[PDB]
């Protein structure tokens, strides 16, 4: 085992975990995870927005989940615990998924998008952009961007600061792509106070 091999392996494993949980906890605002291999075992921490949903009925869910974890993925001794997002309204994949969940409930896209935008910009984001792309308003597909505030697109500050999120809304007639981008209250180079 070479060292780059180790890094690659850890990343790939974690990525596949992330994929599985993204599938299975999409009702829970699954934002992500983190993993530490303590001596007594490997303890992981799921950051999500409804730990109630990830635990289910008295730990049922975490139990079958940790079984899956140690079995399908090489893990010494899973020690799942759960935590929240400190500001999910600044997280953007949770919001993309909430929006897709809404569109699947059946809410109209303008209403859902503007609701989410209002929520984010009241919860304190400097900027927000939302693209909905697909068979909106009939059979020929189109794209709609709902935006508010101040948002950068290009450069390292975009690649770092703004949080990007993507989701599919699987409706009766097809997919709606939901891109969300949120710029929090943090500063850029040309400020110069």
């Amino acid at each position: 085992m070479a060292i780059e091999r180790y890094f690659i392996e850890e990343g790939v494993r974690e990525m596949l975990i992330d994929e599985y949980l993204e599938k299975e906890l999409r009702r829970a605002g699954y934002s992500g995870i983190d993993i530490k291999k303590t001596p007594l075992g490997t303890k992981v921490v799921i950051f999500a927005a409804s730990p109630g949903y990830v635990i289910g009925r008295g730990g049922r869910r975490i139990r079958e989940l940790t079984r899956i974890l140690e079995r399908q993925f090489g893990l010494e001794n899973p020690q799942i615990e759960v935590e929240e997002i400190k500001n999910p309204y600044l997280n953007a994949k949770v919001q993309a998924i909430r929006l897709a969940r809404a569109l699947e409930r059946g809410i109209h896209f303008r209403r859902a998008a503007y609701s989410a935008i209002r929520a984010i910009m009241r919860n304190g984001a400097r900027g927000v952009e939302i693209r909905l792309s697909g068979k909106l308003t009939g059979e020929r597909a189109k794209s709609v961007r709902f935006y508010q505030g101040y948002l950068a697109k290009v450069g390292n500050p975009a690649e770092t600061l703004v949080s990007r999120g993507y989701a599919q809304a699987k409706l009766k007639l097809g997919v709606i792509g939901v891109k969300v981008s949120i710029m929090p209250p943090d500063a850029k180079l040309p400020d110069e106070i």
Partner: protein, 56 residues
């Protein structure tokens, strides 16, 4: 119905059938440079999550 089942998942050891992406399951353009086994498409999709960056 006394017979013998003949699906015969044959264990290739070299070949485009031997190697398969761990995500989608594609057989051809698979990355195996440093222990990876990923289709070029998937890799491009997830490389940031693995820590790969695009400074050039």
């Amino acid at each position: 119905m006394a017979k013998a089942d003949y699906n015969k998942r044959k264990p290739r050891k070299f070949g485009k059938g031997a190697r398969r992406c761990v995500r989608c399951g594609q057989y051809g353009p698979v990355i195996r440079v440093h222990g990876l086994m990923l289709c070029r498409h998937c890799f491009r999709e997830i490389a940031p999550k693995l820590g790969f960056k695009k400074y050039e």
